[PDB]
Design an enzyme around this catalytic site. Structure first.
Site, short mmCIF file in Angstrom:
data_model
loop_
_atom_site.label_atom_id
_atom_site.label_comp_id
_atom_site.label_asym_id
_atom_site.label_seq_id
_atom_site.Cartn_x
_atom_site.Cartn_y
_atom_site.Cartn_z
CB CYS A 177 -4.05 -4.93 -24.80
SG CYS A 177 -2.67 -3.55 -24.13
CG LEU A 178 -6.56 -0.62 -28.98
CD1 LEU A 178 -7.39 -1.52 -29.97
CD2 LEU A 178 -7.52 0.31 -28.29
CB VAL A 215 -0.56 1.50 -23.08
CG1 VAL A 215 -0.50 2.48 -22.10
CG2 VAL A 215 0.01 2.28 -24.36
CB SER A 216 -3.47 0.07 -19.74
OG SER A 216 -4.06 -0.40 -18.56
NE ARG A 217 -7.08 -3.71 -22.58
CZ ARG A 217 -7.95 -3.38 -23.64
NH1 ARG A 217 -9.22 -3.85 -23.58
NH2 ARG A 217 -7.60 -2.50 -24.77
#
Length: 156
Positions: free
Chosen positions: A90-91, A94-96
């Site tokens: 993702c960016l 960390v999350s997606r």
């Protein structure tokens, strides 16, 4: 680092990284990444020699990712079954991307989402799905993972 220190191997043939690692040709070559699951707002095929799965999703607790679990798991699994490597990013990684990989790990093991996250963190410490994704994962662990596990077993 808040965005990792490069793509990290989570399971054989499965890495997580940030948008920069996703463009790292040498890093991609070294890790033999031939599949990339890009999950962020501007996700779209970029490099040559790579099969892409792009999921335009925002990193918001409102963003539904569970609906992308099945296709993400299929993409990752068929890649790994062919002995190839997949980078999910993702960016910040960390999350997606972490959420999708957690879903995958839960499906190929008997792990709940926290044990799956533990598995991810062992490879990429910055892993941390946003609170909303944890909720979706928790739900997945409660009323669907058992269902997904049967699916992969039957499909592959």
């Amino acid at each position: 680092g808040p965005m990792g220190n490069g793509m990290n191997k989570i399971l054989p043939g499965l890495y997580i990284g940030n948008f920069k690692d996703a463009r790292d040709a040498e890093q991609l070559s070294k890790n033999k990444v031939t599949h990339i699951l890009s999950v962020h707002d501007s996700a779209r095929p970029m490099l040559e020699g790579v099969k892409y799965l792009c999921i335009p999703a925002a990193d918001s607790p409102s963003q539904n990712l569970t609906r992308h679990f099945k296709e993400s798991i299929k993409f990752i699994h068929e890649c790994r079954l062919r002995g190839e490597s997949c980078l999910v990013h993702c960016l910040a990684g960390v999350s997606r991307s972490v959420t999708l990989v957690i879903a995958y790990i839960m499906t190929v093991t008997d792990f709940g989402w926290e044990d799956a996250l533990h598995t991810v963190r062992a490879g990429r410490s910055c892993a941390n799905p946003n609170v909303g994704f944890q909720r979706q994962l928790q739900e997945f662990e409660k009323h669907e993972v058992h269902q997904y596990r049967q699916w992969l077993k039957e499909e592959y």
